[PDB]
Amino acid sequence: WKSSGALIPAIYMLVFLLGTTGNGLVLWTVFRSSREKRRSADIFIASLAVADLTFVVTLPLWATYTYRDYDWPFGTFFCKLSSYLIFVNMYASVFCLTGLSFDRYLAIVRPVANARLRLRVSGAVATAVLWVLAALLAMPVMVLRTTGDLENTTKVQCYMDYSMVATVSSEWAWEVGLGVSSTTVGFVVPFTIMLTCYFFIAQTIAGHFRKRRRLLSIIVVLVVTFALCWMPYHLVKTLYMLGSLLHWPCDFDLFLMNIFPYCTCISYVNSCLNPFLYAFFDPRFRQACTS
Amino acid sequence: SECEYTDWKSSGALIPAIYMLVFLLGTTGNGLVLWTVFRSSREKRRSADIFIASLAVADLTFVVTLPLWATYTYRDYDWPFGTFFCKLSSYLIFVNMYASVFCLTGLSFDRYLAIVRPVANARLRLRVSGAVATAVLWVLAALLAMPVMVLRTTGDLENTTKVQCYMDYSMVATVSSEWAWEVGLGVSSTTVGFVVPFTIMLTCYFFIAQTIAGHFRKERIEGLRKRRRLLSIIVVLVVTFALCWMPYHLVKTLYMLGSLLHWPCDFDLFLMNIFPYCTCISYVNSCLNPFLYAFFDPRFRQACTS
Numbered sequence: 001w002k003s004s005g006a007l008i009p010a011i012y013m014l015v016f017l018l019g020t021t022g023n024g025l026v027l028w029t030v031f032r033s034s035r036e037k038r039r040s041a042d043i044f045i046a047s048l049a050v051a052d053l054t055f056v057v058t059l060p061l062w063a064t065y066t067y068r069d070y071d072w073p074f075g076t077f078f079c080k081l082s083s084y085l086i087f088v089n090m091y092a093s094v095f096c097l098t099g100l101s102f103d104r105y106l107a108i109v110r111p112v113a114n115a116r117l118r119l120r121v122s123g124a125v126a127t128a129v130l131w132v133l134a135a136l137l138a139m140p141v142m143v144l145r146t147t148g149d150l151e152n153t154t155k156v157q158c159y160m161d162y163s164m165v166a167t168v169s170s171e172w173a174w175e176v177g178l179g180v181s182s183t184t185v186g187f188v189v190p191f192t193i194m195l196t197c198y199f200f201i202a203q204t205i206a207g208h209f210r211k212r213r214r215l216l217s218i219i220v221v222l223v224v225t226f227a228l229c230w231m232p233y234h235l236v237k238t239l240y241m242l243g244s245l246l247h248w249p250c251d252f253d254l255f256l257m258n259i260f261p262y263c264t265c266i267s268y269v270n271s272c273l274n275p276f277l278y279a280f281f282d283p284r285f286r287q288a289c290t291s
Numbered sequence: 292s293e294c295e296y297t298d299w300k301s302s303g304a305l306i307p308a309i310y311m312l313v314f315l316l317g318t319t320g321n322g323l324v325l326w327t328v329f330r331s332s333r334e335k336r337r338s339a340d341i342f343i344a345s346l347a348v349a350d351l352t353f354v355v356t357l358p359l360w361a362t363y364t365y366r367d368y369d370w371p372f373g374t375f376f377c378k379l380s381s382y383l384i385f386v387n388m389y390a391s392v393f394c395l396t397g398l399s400f401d402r403y404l405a406i407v408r409p410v411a412n413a414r415l416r417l418r419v420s421g422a423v424a425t426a427v428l429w430v431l432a433a434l435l436a437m438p439v440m441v442l443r444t445t446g447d448l449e450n451t452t453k454v455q456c457y458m459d460y461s462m463v464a465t466v467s468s469e470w471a472w473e474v475g476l477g478v479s480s481t482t483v484g485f486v487v488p489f490t491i492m493l494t495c496y497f498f499i500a501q502t503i504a505g506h507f508r509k510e511r512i513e514g515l516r517k518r519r520r521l522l523s524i525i526v527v528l529v530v531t532f533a534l535c536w537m538p539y540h541l542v543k544t545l546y547m548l549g550s551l552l553h554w555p556c557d558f559d560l561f562l563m564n565i566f567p568y569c570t571c572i573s574y575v576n577s578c579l580n581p582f583l584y585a586f587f588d589p590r591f592r593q594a595c596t597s
């Protein structure tokens with residue numbers, strides 16, 4: 001329903017412009033700051049911004065893909081690269097948010113052991129392992145993503161081919177396994193660990209009941225926005241798989257199919273909303289704007 | 292008729308291999324030289340340094356598109372990346388050429404106002420700022436390369452399945468007058484990419500050389516490194532840019548000229564056979580600059596030690 005014309009391409013283009021500008025500005029803010037002033041959360045913020053930027057560079061290609069009634073003229077390599085960068089964005093962003101939340105748990109709840117942990121492991125090592133893990137986890141996308149003229153309508157569609165590793169019979173198993181693993185690694189387990197960190201933070205903060213509140217408020221706003229922007233996508237995707245497995249009504253399946261593009265759109269919009277969230281809450285980002 | 296048989300002997304994978312090698316070396320070296328120039332203090336950052344950074348950025352923007360050209364050459368000249376990337380890659384080649392020659396001209400003129408007349412250097416710095424100069428040259432390069440972006444198209448010429456990233460002059464001229472547009476674009480590109488910039492560079496260098504010979508009234512090999520360093524590195528950069536791009540411009544101009552004067556067929560075949568290698572050297576220049584920086588001007592070498 002609601003073919004919507006060019007709403008999705010227009011929103012993709014808008015997110016491209018605003019995400020590029022805002023993420024560049026936030027990178028300028030974080031790198032222009034002194035290394036002495038450079039806080040632990042700054043490296044995670046920078047990595048989050050880099051992930052968003054690497055996604056929004058490919059966003060114009062997705063806008064063109066949508067505008068052309070799903071025809072991909074950029075070839076196989078850029079199909080693989082764009083899908084891979086999408087999943088790298090998702091994984092690295094949720095991992096950076098997890099790192100920020102764990103840092104807040106270390107500081108607010110029990111800073112003494114936080115000092116020892118900071119002595120053992122530096123932030124740069126954490127960022128390195130985070131990015132290599134994200135790249136490794138998104139590798140299946142790059143290996144399996146391909147370019148094909150499905151339905152013999154002279155339209156090229158950038159789709160994941162599971163015939164490279166699985167036959168026709170086990171293609172459903174491979175697709176469901178990859179989807180469930182992607183959900184568990186990008187939403188479920190990171191949200192579980194972040195919720196545990198936030199729960200102990202909430203208990204210790206009941207005991208405490210502004211300096212900690214600055215960082216906690218901005219990070220919780222970031223995490224809640226990430227939740228509201230990615231929960232629709234994971235929910236619709238997992239629900240579609242469970243509907244295929246358990247034979248849910250076809251009306252609900254049609255509803256999920258028609259709402260999937262919009263959920264993907266909001267998941268993409270998160271990248272552009274991150275800088276305005278920094279501007280509204282973080283006083284340093286406002287300082288950079290004035291300075 | 293008699294000529295136009297083939298392109299000498301098959302290069303195999305030599306052109307794609309050199310393209311990939313230049314991609315790797317140019318990316319690494321240009322990134323490292325950008326790190327060197329940017330890590331240096333802004334107060335310490337010399338006037339030549341910002342032109343150096345612009346040169347490195349142009350080289351980087353070209354070498355990022357270089358893998359696509361390597362893939363294009365590997366698949367017997369078949370372009371699978373689309374018309375947008377054809378336009379972007381060709382436009383970035385021309386932006387690289389123009390910006391590099393303009394930065395070299397700016398470096399040469401900076402050395403001119405440094406050695407020939409130290410007095411007017413401050414006045415000319417006051418009149419035009421360095422950052423303003425780089426912004427002007429970059430917008431000039433973008434505008435001059437815009438015809439490349441507009442006129443590029445991907446098409447399945449010769450009725451084969453191959454897709455060639457080529458220049459379509461039909462959108463701006465008729466078939467009969469396509470030659471006029473092609474010759475005009477080529478001659479203008481040569482004039483504002485090699486001829487005029489090298490003319491002003493040679494004039495500045497001639498007066499620079501006369502001013503230095505004023506001190507070198509007698510034959511003295513080598514020079515006082517303290518003042519020599521920048522001039523030496525800029526001269527080697529200019530000489531290597533000449534040696535890497537002059538073959539390309541020379542073959543291009545000779546082919547366009549023989550389109551009228553009708554050179555002998557064998558010579559036209561020779562030019563056609565040699566064109567890919569001239570393009571290859573012109574592309575090598577981009578990665579070549581960092582190793583030159585690692586040999587002269589101990590800035591770059593000490594940066595590695597630090």
Ligand SMILES: CC(C)CCC[C@@H](C)[C@H]1CC[C@H]2[C@@H]3CC=C4C[C@@H](O)CC[C@]4(C)[C@H]3CC[C@]12C
Nearest residue numbers: 074075076077078315358359361362370371372
């Ligand atoms: C449309 C399709 C067929 C085009 C295929 C293009 C292929 C051959 C090209 C495009 C860009 C290339 C990559 C560009 C950059 C890198 C990173 C470098 O550290 C190793 C090589 C590697 C990984 C290249 C491998 C080959 C590559 C993937």
Ligand SMILES: CC(C)CCC[C@@H](C)[C@H]1CC[C@H]2[C@@H]3CC=C4C[C@@H](O)CC[C@]4(C)[C@H]3CC[C@]12C
Nearest residue numbers: 016017060061064072073074372373374375376
């Ligand atoms: C193969 C063909 C059909 C694809 C064409 C894609 C077109 C519509 C897309 C691809 C990338 C896009 C560009 C990406 C970035 C910028 C910079 C921005 O400041 C102005 C718009 C501009 C210049 C876009 C214009 C539209 C654009 C060129």
